[PDB]
Design a protein around this ligand. Structure first.
Ligand SMILES: CCCCCCCCCCCCCC(=O)O
Length: 135
Protein backbone atom coordinates (compact mmCIF):
# COMPACT_ATOMS: atom_id res chain seq x y z
CA UNK A 1 0.00 0.00 0.00
CA UNK A 2 1.64 3.18 -1.26
CA UNK A 3 1.24 6.82 -2.01
CA UNK A 4 3.72 8.55 -4.37
CA UNK A 5 4.61 12.02 -5.63
CA UNK A 6 6.90 13.33 -8.32
CA UNK A 7 8.88 16.45 -7.47
CA UNK A 8 10.46 18.72 -10.12
CA UNK A 9 13.28 20.94 -8.98
CA UNK A 10 15.82 23.35 -10.43
CA UNK A 11 17.86 23.25 -7.22
CA UNK A 12 21.11 21.20 -7.17
CA UNK A 13 19.59 17.72 -7.15
CA UNK A 14 22.26 16.23 -4.91
CA UNK A 15 21.86 18.91 -2.24
CA UNK A 16 18.13 18.24 -2.49
CA UNK A 17 18.65 14.50 -2.04
CA UNK A 18 21.01 15.14 0.92
CA UNK A 19 18.46 17.37 2.67
CA UNK A 20 15.80 14.64 2.22
CA UNK A 21 18.35 12.25 3.91
CA UNK A 22 17.93 14.36 7.08
CA UNK A 23 14.91 12.99 8.93
CA UNK A 24 14.55 16.30 10.77
CA UNK A 25 13.60 17.78 7.43
CA UNK A 26 11.78 14.89 5.79
CA UNK A 27 9.59 13.45 8.63
CA UNK A 28 7.97 16.80 9.69
CA UNK A 29 7.50 17.82 6.00
CA UNK A 30 5.65 14.60 5.05
CA UNK A 31 4.13 12.76 8.02
CA UNK A 32 0.70 13.97 9.39
CA UNK A 33 0.75 16.66 12.18
CA UNK A 34 4.32 16.07 13.47
CA UNK A 35 4.72 18.03 16.69
CA UNK A 36 8.06 16.62 17.99
CA UNK A 37 11.21 15.32 16.23
CA UNK A 38 14.38 14.01 17.87
CA UNK A 39 17.46 13.25 15.95
CA UNK A 40 19.41 10.83 18.09
CA UNK A 41 22.28 10.64 15.51
CA UNK A 42 22.20 11.73 11.78
CA UNK A 43 20.53 8.49 10.68
CA UNK A 44 18.21 7.74 13.63
CA UNK A 45 15.03 9.67 14.60
CA UNK A 46 11.96 9.55 16.80
CA UNK A 47 8.93 11.74 16.24
CA UNK A 48 5.41 12.30 17.56
CA UNK A 49 2.44 13.43 15.58
CA UNK A 50 -1.37 13.48 15.57
CA UNK A 51 -4.12 13.44 12.96
CA UNK A 52 -7.81 13.44 13.85
CA UNK A 53 -8.14 12.01 17.36
CA UNK A 54 -5.02 9.82 16.85
CA UNK A 55 -1.64 10.55 18.45
CA UNK A 56 1.23 8.42 17.29
CA UNK A 57 4.93 7.92 18.04
CA UNK A 58 7.15 6.85 15.08
CA UNK A 59 10.90 6.10 15.07
CA UNK A 60 13.22 4.80 12.41
CA UNK A 61 16.49 4.81 10.55
CA UNK A 62 17.76 6.37 7.36
CA UNK A 63 19.79 4.40 4.82
CA UNK A 64 21.62 6.23 2.05
CA UNK A 65 22.24 4.47 -1.28
CA UNK A 66 23.14 5.42 -4.83
CA UNK A 67 20.61 8.07 -5.88
CA UNK A 68 18.26 6.94 -3.06
CA UNK A 69 17.28 7.62 0.52
CA UNK A 70 15.30 4.93 2.36
CA UNK A 71 13.76 5.62 5.72
CA UNK A 72 12.55 2.43 7.55
CA UNK A 73 10.11 3.28 10.36
CA UNK A 74 7.91 1.60 13.01
CA UNK A 75 5.07 3.12 14.99
CA UNK A 76 2.14 2.34 17.25
CA UNK A 77 -0.01 2.95 14.11
CA UNK A 78 1.88 0.60 11.75
CA UNK A 79 5.26 0.36 10.07
CA UNK A 80 6.58 1.24 6.69
CA UNK A 81 9.26 2.58 4.37
CA UNK A 82 9.59 6.08 2.89
CA UNK A 83 11.74 6.15 -0.29
CA UNK A 84 13.17 9.31 -1.91
CA UNK A 85 14.61 8.35 -5.37
CA UNK A 86 16.48 10.63 -7.74
CA UNK A 87 15.07 10.04 -11.24
CA UNK A 88 17.20 12.53 -13.20
CA UNK A 89 18.96 15.82 -12.70
CA UNK A 90 15.64 17.65 -12.22
CA UNK A 91 13.26 15.12 -10.78
CA UNK A 92 12.79 12.88 -7.85
CA UNK A 93 10.09 10.54 -6.62
CA UNK A 94 8.81 10.19 -3.12
CA UNK A 95 7.10 6.89 -2.18
CA UNK A 96 5.56 6.13 1.20
CA UNK A 97 4.48 2.49 1.83
CA UNK A 98 2.68 1.71 5.05
CA UNK A 99 1.65 -1.74 6.46
CA UNK A 100 -1.55 -0.81 8.28
CA UNK A 101 -4.59 -0.44 6.05
CA UNK A 102 -6.77 1.45 8.60
CA UNK A 103 -3.97 3.95 9.39
CA UNK A 104 -3.28 4.36 5.65
CA UNK A 105 -6.95 5.17 4.97
CA UNK A 106 -7.07 7.86 7.63
CA UNK A 107 -3.54 9.27 7.14
CA UNK A 108 -3.43 9.37 3.34
CA UNK A 109 -5.15 12.76 2.82
CA UNK A 110 -2.68 14.40 5.31
CA UNK A 111 0.29 12.80 3.61
CA UNK A 112 -1.02 13.70 0.16
CA UNK A 113 -1.58 17.30 1.24
CA UNK A 114 2.04 17.42 2.48
CA UNK A 115 3.38 15.92 -0.75
CA UNK A 116 1.38 18.38 -2.87
CA UNK A 117 2.70 21.27 -0.75
CA UNK A 118 6.31 20.05 -1.06
CA UNK A 119 5.94 19.61 -4.82
CA UNK A 120 4.54 23.08 -5.27
CA UNK A 121 7.09 24.83 -3.05
CA UNK A 122 10.18 22.60 -3.18
CA UNK A 123 12.73 25.11 -4.48
CA UNK A 124 11.72 27.93 -2.07
CA UNK A 125 11.77 25.40 0.85
CA UNK A 126 15.20 24.06 -0.16
CA UNK A 127 16.60 27.59 -0.73
CA UNK A 128 15.84 28.49 2.92
CA UNK A 129 17.20 25.07 4.08
CA UNK A 130 20.44 25.75 2.30
CA UNK A 131 20.83 29.20 3.87
CA UNK A 132 20.33 27.75 7.39
CA UNK A 133 22.50 24.66 6.78
CA UNK A 134 25.20 26.54 4.77
CA UNK A 135 25.29 23.97 1.93
C1 LIG B 1 3.48 6.80 11.16
C2 LIG B 1 2.14 6.40 11.72
C3 LIG B 1 1.07 7.28 11.13
C4 LIG B 1 1.41 7.43 9.68
C5 LIG B 1 0.24 7.76 8.81
C6 LIG B 1 0.73 7.15 7.52
C7 LIG B 1 -0.22 7.37 6.37
C8 LIG B 1 0.25 6.49 5.24
C9 LIG B 1 -0.74 6.54 4.11
C10 LIG B 1 -0.32 5.69 2.94
C11 LIG B 1 -1.38 5.74 1.84
C12 LIG B 1 -1.47 4.51 0.91
C13 LIG B 1 -2.78 3.72 1.09
C14 LIG B 1 -3.85 3.90 0.01
O1 LIG B 1 -3.60 3.74 -1.21
O2 LIG B 1 -5.03 4.19 0.35
Amino acid sequence: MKVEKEIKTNQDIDVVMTIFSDPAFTIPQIFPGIASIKCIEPEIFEAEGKFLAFSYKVKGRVYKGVDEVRIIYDSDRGNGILYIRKKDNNTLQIILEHDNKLTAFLGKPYVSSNLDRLAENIDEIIRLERIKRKI
